[PDB]
Amino acid sequence: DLADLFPGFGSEWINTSSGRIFARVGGDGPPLLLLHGFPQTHVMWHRVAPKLAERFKVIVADLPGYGWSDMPESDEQHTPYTKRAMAKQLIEAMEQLGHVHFALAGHDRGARVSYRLALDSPGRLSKLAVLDILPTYEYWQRMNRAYALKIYHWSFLAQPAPLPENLLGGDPDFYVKAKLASWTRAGDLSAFDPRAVEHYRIAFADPMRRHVMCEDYRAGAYADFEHDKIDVEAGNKIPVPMLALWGASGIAQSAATPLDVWRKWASDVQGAPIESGHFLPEEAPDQTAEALVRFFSA
Template sequence: MSEAALPDLFPGFETRHVETRSGSLFCRVGGRGLPLLLVHGYPQSHAMWHKVAPELAKRFTLVIPDLPGYGRSSIPALSDDHAAYSKRAAGNAMIDLMSALGHDRFALVGHDRGARVSYRMALDHPDRLTRVAVLDILPTFDYWRRMDRAFALKIYHWAFLAQPAPFPENMIAASADYYLDHTLASWTAAKDLSAFHPDALAHYHAFFSQADRIAATCEDYRAGATIDLDHDKADVEAGRKIDVPLLALWGGAGIAQSGETPLDVWRRWASDAQGTAIGGGHFMAEENPEELLQKLLPFLEKDA
């Protein structure tokens, strides 16, 4: 399906293309109130927020972008050091985006890869954030540290997508629709696609049908196995912590809940961390938007 024919999941929202250090970012902007940036994860796009955006827009001015290389945003060039796809580079692009839209300080909610960008922003740009929520992840450093047999089977894609190009790209492109649907379904509590609106799936399939965007998402994971891990290690070794108030939410049947309690981990990384599990799997904004809003709003509204 062409981009022009994709369903509009955010009626009443403005469409913007904003130039940043990582190229042009596509985003939707709408609502009223203090600014709130919502950052999606893999293998999705900004469309993943469509079930919670209407309620959040009653209280906040929402900025909902596609990450560099994803959806309809520009595709940074690949490189041997994977730096263009580091979470630091993506975070810098988000800072550029919010600055261009006139938001000096803002709240931030990220899911999956977007949550990795979010906690990196909290470490690199604490003066720009009022508070940050991370959905169904642990820090990259902790994921690699706990990669035993059981966890490796659960998140096999971390090692698969990080393999040298073009191996994972070619394997995925050979049956991209199957790979995408399997990935989405397997990370839900129900192990099917019932949580995903057909219009949202149309968005995900549209961008995942493009070979250069499949390559960009693989590069995202190569960065996660190299430069992102280096950045996390540097913070751990320096004793650096997140000082922005942090909320960690995870699916009861999600990815982050394996092993140690996620909140225990985040309390090692953040001086002011709270959090809890909610019902469902990894894709809580689509599997359980009502409970996600119940947990997010009290946290976000403390600054309203």
């Protein structure tokens, strides 16, 4: 029993060469793809998507391997869960809808897909919004004691299988709720809709889903970093107009200033802090939706 948090939205099973993407689709107008992160699903957008759907064709997709999207078989390089592969799959997904040029907002892992998409295929994007991330390269390059402790899961989940999978299995309900709570401003689950939490908890209860998330983070430690590094070293910048939103107490702000980081990565970036923890669309949906509406409309 899982709640429908996007009333009026259709539900699309969208075929790609690497498996189906699940998406809620609502609204009309320019296509806007919304990509969730860890440890969530598309439903994390449930408070923001209705206001975006007032002006956009909003496609709220489960990342490859997440939520209800199919799980491509991974390989030794975790290729299907590299942000490059995920980006290609989502591009293919959008093409199945006739969307070859779209707006894109990603949060967390989906924001990593998003900026990698913008680096690999900038022509696909009219505008890009990333929510509470710095590029994966930057996390790994600023890796120090403080960051290692704060984003320990970047190294923990990247451990070779089945070490994180076995440990996650030790208490999956606790773990997913722990991540959700610990990354909010409040430090508990009160910022979330309980029915959304149920979606995340059921997704996290599936061992195969958890393995995918580890594959995502293994990619994030290896191929994703290597891909980002190539762009840093080649000076490749995102040419799409982009909005960087970060929580005042989110993952990205401490020990940086995300805008001055993203300016290294994008030619044309606007940014603003949102009074929120990591889960901007759920902890501060009105502020997040307003900034997204404003940035994507004109």
